[PDB]
């Protein structure tokens, strides 16, 4: 796997939990079940990157632990209406934490990233960034995304890009644009098809977790 | 670490994530949502004891995954008022889990283990069994509970006993009472102390999580 | 329906969800979700109960609201492993909530109420109580709770005691003996059988939250 | 109030809790928990305009209840990224219901409705509609919103329109494009300001849940 690739641990139970959202048999209400699982592990890898420092606990009875306290700020951002599934799964792992949205698409007529839709934390620039998206299939969307982070102040080697499962395709895509980005999957699956889903993939994620 | 404990690797994040829970300044709200995150890592931990089988899995599209199937039934059996504070990280990985329920003292006549109160599965003997007691301190409760599963069948290394943390002690004499039951732990610390709370420690477990 | 019993409208909605949850054929999974959404309408009815004094709000930009304010403090308190189903609801509803535990028998031998486990708030007797037991059959397990809180300070017209069914029988003990406690339930059903469940019921609450 | 236009009790307790999601003290952690409890009761309310048949149910031990079965199929539909926020209330009210979505903004250029993103159940003509949007101030987005959702076969009278808060102009504005839709709000207040936010309101709902 390459560099700033980080794969979740390819575990049996791993295994057999994306065979389940992986299944055309499963149906939305344990494909949202076992997504969220999922994202909630993806979220936990992430978190594993964020820096600490030591510090002395003080624990009831006069004791003292020697522990350590997060010196990340962070914030989710999500980016297709898909990325919005995986909001629950950070906020069940960071309490309260703040979650932005971008909604960005290439101009049809200059084919130049255009901005539908932006709310960030006003202090986004000091924060870590968990960038939320299902499926790493081109990396269109993301890759336009981190444009507007970083355009926002956002260090790029505080950006890490969650997504259940990437093509190899996206992966060289958004690394070629923005190698200093981590990206956090679950699953690196073999191709793209011709409406440019991940083969052999899960269908539509976000379909399958909404409407169908 | 002793054979048959497996401790929840010690990361940097980790180590913050207890540091929360530790903390006496730390208050319920997030004492409670901590305290959850934690005990969803000690139960994907022990689902990662459970067994699989190679499967096709059958992806839309057409698409063929070589993927894996659980092999375990399981249910959780929580033990003292305070495991009851667990079931919902279990269920928030297991849809819909069995969850059962054993009450059990030392007959303070007899000193002989009498039995409260126990609802379990009517198929138990078959099933993966997550013991759930925050904190393995002396290990007294876990240890009649464990006595009652493998009256009512339980196979003993079909046993996972779930703690946020353990004193050496209670590992001592669960593990020289119950040696092929795993002990799932996400710490463990110094000693005991004259009313048998583990220190350092993080207080009593139970009054945090649920009165104070 | 008598002084001091309080009975969520029965509406069409009502009646449908109370369906889902009797209906014999209904798995753990939906038994389980549909209970959760009826426990947290039995918080909201007993909410209701509660004082509050006026008070002016100031929102965003400069303007005042004329709004409201709690005057209760509250926690909960369950009395069986079945009250502890509807620890999450109560806390879906009122933000970390503090929740207690009686745990309490006839003394077989005695006959009179012998104390297994008791964990309550400090401050307890500052506090409105909702007692939290999901069938009113007898009521014989919640008559001894009660007498445990009011020996502990609670005011008698501070206790609410939340149920998803009654039976008569269950009613008139308990208002026998504690005529100013609100009972708060979603249905009154028919009598009890020869085991002392309900009639038509649900069958056994418990088992099927739990374990069948 | 106006025909069609359906206001949750003015209970104390509801008002206490808008005191608490209206106060501009109030800090996001117990702001979403707050507002996430108005929208189930949102979501009750909605789900209380729907149909049923009367029919037995079969209880265990051979007893028959007279109960009733839902006859409206539902999904939920956000309109705006506030919206979003909606949605875990009614999934926590119906269990894993499809949920939509409709982004469509006035064309600059044309001054005409222009979607940006649409995704809808396949069988949404045959379905109930909740159409979710925290806050009704001048309506404009759930117009040109519900006109998408006519245009794909939803009945008039099968759209349900929740909101948190509304005013009196938004609901004028709606009411007299679509008179037929019903309007669920939980309060109206008094007038917009030149920014066309809702007062006294709440400031802004969407950077309040998820961002400051
Ligand atoms: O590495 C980390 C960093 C942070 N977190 C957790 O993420 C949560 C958000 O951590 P933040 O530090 O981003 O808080 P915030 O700025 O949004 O908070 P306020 O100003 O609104 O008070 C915090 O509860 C923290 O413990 C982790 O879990 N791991
Ligand atoms: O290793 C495992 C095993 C099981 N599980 C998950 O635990 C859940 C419970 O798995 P069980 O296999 O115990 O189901 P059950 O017997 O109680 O189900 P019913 O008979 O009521 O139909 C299942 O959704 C499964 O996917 C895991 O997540 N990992
Ligand atoms: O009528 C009420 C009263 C209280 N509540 C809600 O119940 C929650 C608990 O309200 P409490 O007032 O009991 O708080 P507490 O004493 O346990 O809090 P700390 O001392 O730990 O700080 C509070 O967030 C309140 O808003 C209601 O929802 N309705
Ligand atoms: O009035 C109602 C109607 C429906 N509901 C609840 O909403 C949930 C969704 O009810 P639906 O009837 O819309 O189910 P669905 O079509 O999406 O289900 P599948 O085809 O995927 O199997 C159901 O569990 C129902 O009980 C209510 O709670 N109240």
Redesign the interface.
């Given at each position: 796997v390459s560099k700033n690739v980080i794969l979740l641990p390819q575990?049996?139970?791993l295994?057999?939990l994306?065979?389940i959202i992986?299944?055309?048999?499963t149906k939305?209400?344990?494909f949202?079940?076992?997504s969220?699982?999922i994202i909630?592990?993806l979220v936990?890898e992430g978190?594993?990157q964020?820096?600490?420092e030591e510090?002395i606990?003080?624990?009831?009875?006069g004791?003292?632990?020697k522990?350590?306290?997060?010196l990340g700020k962070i914030?989710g951002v999500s980016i297709v209406?898909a990325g919005?599934s995986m909001?629950?799964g950070l906020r069940?792992?960071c309490?309260?934490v703040?979650?932005?949205?971008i909604?960005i698409q290439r101009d049809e007529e200059t084919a130049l990233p255009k901005l539908?839709?932006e709310?960030?934390?006003?202090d986004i620039s000091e924060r870590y960034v968990f960038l939320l998206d299902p499926m790493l299939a081109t990396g269109g969307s993301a890759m336009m995304a981190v444009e507007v982070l970083l355009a926002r102040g956002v260090k790029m080697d505080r950006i890490l890009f969650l997504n259940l499962l990437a093509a190899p395709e996206g992966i060289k895509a958004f690394q070629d644009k923005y190698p200093d980005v981590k990206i956090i999957t679950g699953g690196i699956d073999e191709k793209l098809?011709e409406n440019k889903?991940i083969?052999?993939?899960?269908?539509?994620f976000?379909?399958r977790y909404?409407?169908?």
């Open positions: 575990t049996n139970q295994i057999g994306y065979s992986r299944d055309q048999r939305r209400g344990d949202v079940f076992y969220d699982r909630r592990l936990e978190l594993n964020l820096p600490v510090a606990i003080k624990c009831h009875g004791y003292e632990y522990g350590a306290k997060f914030c209406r919005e909001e629950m069940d792992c309490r309260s703040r979650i932005g949205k909604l539908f839709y709310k960030l934390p006003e098809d889903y083969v052999p993939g899960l269908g539509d976000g379909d909404y409407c169908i």
